Design a protein around this ligand. Sequence first.
Ligand SMILES: [Ca+2]
Ligand SMILES: [Cu+2]
Length: 127
Amino acid sequence: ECSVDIQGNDQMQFNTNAITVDKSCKQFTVNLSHPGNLPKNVMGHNWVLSTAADMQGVVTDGMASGLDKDYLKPDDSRVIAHTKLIGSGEKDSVTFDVSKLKEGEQYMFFCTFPGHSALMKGTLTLK
Ligand SMILES: [Ca+2]
Ligand SMILES: [Cu+2]
Protein backbone atom coordinates (compact mmCIF):
# COMPACT_ATOMS: atom_id res chain seq x y z
CA GLU A 1 0.00 0.00 0.00
CA CYS A 2 0.80 3.49 -1.01
CA SER A 3 4.44 3.09 -2.02
CA VAL A 4 6.62 2.09 -4.92
CA ASP A 5 10.22 0.93 -5.00
CA ILE A 6 12.02 2.23 -8.09
CA GLN A 7 15.55 1.89 -9.36
CA GLY A 8 17.74 4.04 -11.63
CA ASN A 9 20.58 2.01 -12.99
CA ASP A 10 23.94 2.48 -14.73
CA GLN A 11 22.21 2.38 -18.19
CA MET A 12 20.15 5.52 -17.61
CA GLN A 13 16.99 3.55 -17.03
CA PHE A 14 14.23 3.62 -14.47
CA ASN A 15 12.57 0.15 -13.91
CA THR A 16 9.08 1.48 -14.42
CA ASN A 17 7.46 3.95 -16.82
CA ALA A 18 4.07 3.95 -15.11
CA ILE A 19 3.34 4.38 -11.48
CA THR A 20 -0.22 3.70 -10.20
CA VAL A 21 -1.35 5.38 -6.90
CA ASP A 22 -4.45 3.90 -5.30
CA LYS A 23 -6.88 6.84 -4.91
CA SER A 24 -7.55 6.23 -1.14
CA CYS A 25 -3.90 6.93 -0.33
CA LYS A 26 -3.30 9.96 1.84
CA GLN A 27 0.48 9.92 1.50
CA PHE A 28 2.39 8.19 -1.25
CA THR A 29 6.06 7.19 -0.94
CA VAL A 30 8.72 6.59 -3.56
CA ASN A 31 11.78 4.62 -2.53
CA LEU A 32 14.63 5.21 -5.07
CA SER A 33 17.81 3.19 -5.17
CA HIS A 34 20.74 3.01 -7.57
CA PRO A 35 22.18 -0.42 -8.30
CA GLY A 36 25.35 -0.48 -10.21
CA ASN A 37 28.71 1.27 -9.79
CA LEU A 38 28.75 4.71 -11.37
CA PRO A 39 29.11 7.72 -9.08
CA LYS A 40 26.67 10.50 -8.64
CA ASN A 41 28.43 13.09 -10.65
CA VAL A 42 28.61 10.73 -13.71
CA MET A 43 25.18 8.97 -13.62
CA GLY A 44 23.34 10.20 -10.57
CA HIS A 45 19.58 9.93 -10.48
CA ASN A 46 16.72 11.53 -8.72
CA TRP A 47 12.97 11.09 -8.92
CA VAL A 48 11.00 14.18 -9.55
CA LEU A 49 7.28 14.71 -10.01
CA SER A 50 5.47 17.52 -11.86
CA THR A 51 2.50 18.15 -14.08
CA ALA A 52 3.14 17.11 -17.71
CA ALA A 53 3.07 20.78 -18.70
CA ASP A 54 5.75 21.75 -16.07
CA MET A 55 8.19 18.97 -16.82
CA GLN A 56 10.25 20.67 -19.41
CA GLY A 57 10.78 23.78 -17.39
CA VAL A 58 11.64 21.83 -14.21
CA VAL A 59 14.21 19.92 -16.21
CA THR A 60 15.77 23.05 -17.85
CA ASP A 61 15.88 24.92 -14.56
CA GLY A 62 17.38 21.86 -12.86
CA MET A 63 20.18 21.64 -15.31
CA ALA A 64 20.89 25.36 -14.70
CA SER A 65 20.97 24.85 -10.87
CA GLY A 66 23.69 22.28 -11.14
CA LEU A 67 25.06 19.24 -9.27
CA ASP A 68 25.47 20.99 -5.93
CA LYS A 69 21.61 21.53 -5.95
CA ASP A 70 20.83 18.02 -7.06
CA TYR A 71 19.96 19.34 -10.52
CA LEU A 72 16.84 21.03 -9.16
CA LYS A 73 15.84 24.57 -8.73
CA PRO A 74 15.71 25.33 -4.97
CA ASP A 75 12.02 25.38 -3.78
CA ASP A 76 10.70 24.99 -7.37
CA SER A 77 7.05 25.48 -6.99
CA ARG A 78 6.33 23.17 -9.90
CA VAL A 79 7.89 20.15 -8.15
CA ILE A 80 5.21 18.26 -6.41
CA ALA A 81 7.88 16.08 -4.80
CA HIS A 82 11.38 14.90 -5.29
CA THR A 83 14.07 12.70 -3.95
CA LYS A 84 17.69 13.64 -3.48
CA LEU A 85 20.16 12.93 -6.25
CA ILE A 86 21.91 9.60 -5.52
CA GLY A 87 24.78 7.69 -6.96
CA SER A 88 25.48 4.00 -7.04
CA GLY A 89 24.89 2.15 -3.86
CA GLU A 90 22.74 4.93 -2.31
CA LYS A 91 19.03 5.28 -1.72
CA ASP A 92 16.57 7.98 -0.85
CA SER A 93 12.85 8.16 -0.23
CA VAL A 94 10.28 10.90 -0.42
CA THR A 95 6.68 11.01 0.71
CA PHE A 96 4.14 13.48 -0.58
CA ASP A 97 0.54 14.24 0.03
CA VAL A 98 -1.86 12.64 -2.45
CA SER A 99 -4.08 15.67 -2.09
CA LYS A 100 -1.42 17.55 -4.13
CA LEU A 101 -2.72 15.44 -7.16
CA LYS A 102 -6.12 16.03 -8.99
CA GLU A 103 -8.37 13.72 -11.08
CA GLY A 104 -8.06 14.49 -14.77
CA GLU A 105 -4.55 16.02 -14.48
CA GLN A 106 -1.61 14.29 -16.09
CA TYR A 107 1.52 13.84 -13.93
CA MET A 108 5.02 12.84 -15.09
CA PHE A 109 7.99 11.72 -13.18
CA PHE A 110 11.55 12.01 -14.38
CA CYS A 111 15.14 12.27 -13.47
CA THR A 112 16.71 15.76 -13.87
CA PHE A 113 20.37 14.79 -14.13
CA PRO A 114 21.40 16.30 -17.46
CA GLY A 115 20.19 14.31 -20.43
CA HIS A 116 18.55 11.49 -18.42
CA SER A 117 14.93 12.64 -18.91
CA ALA A 118 15.18 11.58 -22.65
CA LEU A 119 14.65 7.98 -21.37
CA MET A 120 14.12 8.31 -17.54
CA LYS A 121 10.53 9.47 -17.41
CA GLY A 122 7.05 7.96 -17.08
CA THR A 123 3.51 8.60 -15.94
CA LEU A 124 2.08 8.76 -12.46
CA THR A 125 -1.71 8.18 -12.30
CA LEU A 126 -4.40 7.67 -9.74
CA LYS A 127 -6.32 4.29 -9.90
CA1 LIG B 1 13.73 11.74 2.39
CU1 LIG C 1 19.26 10.04 -13.83
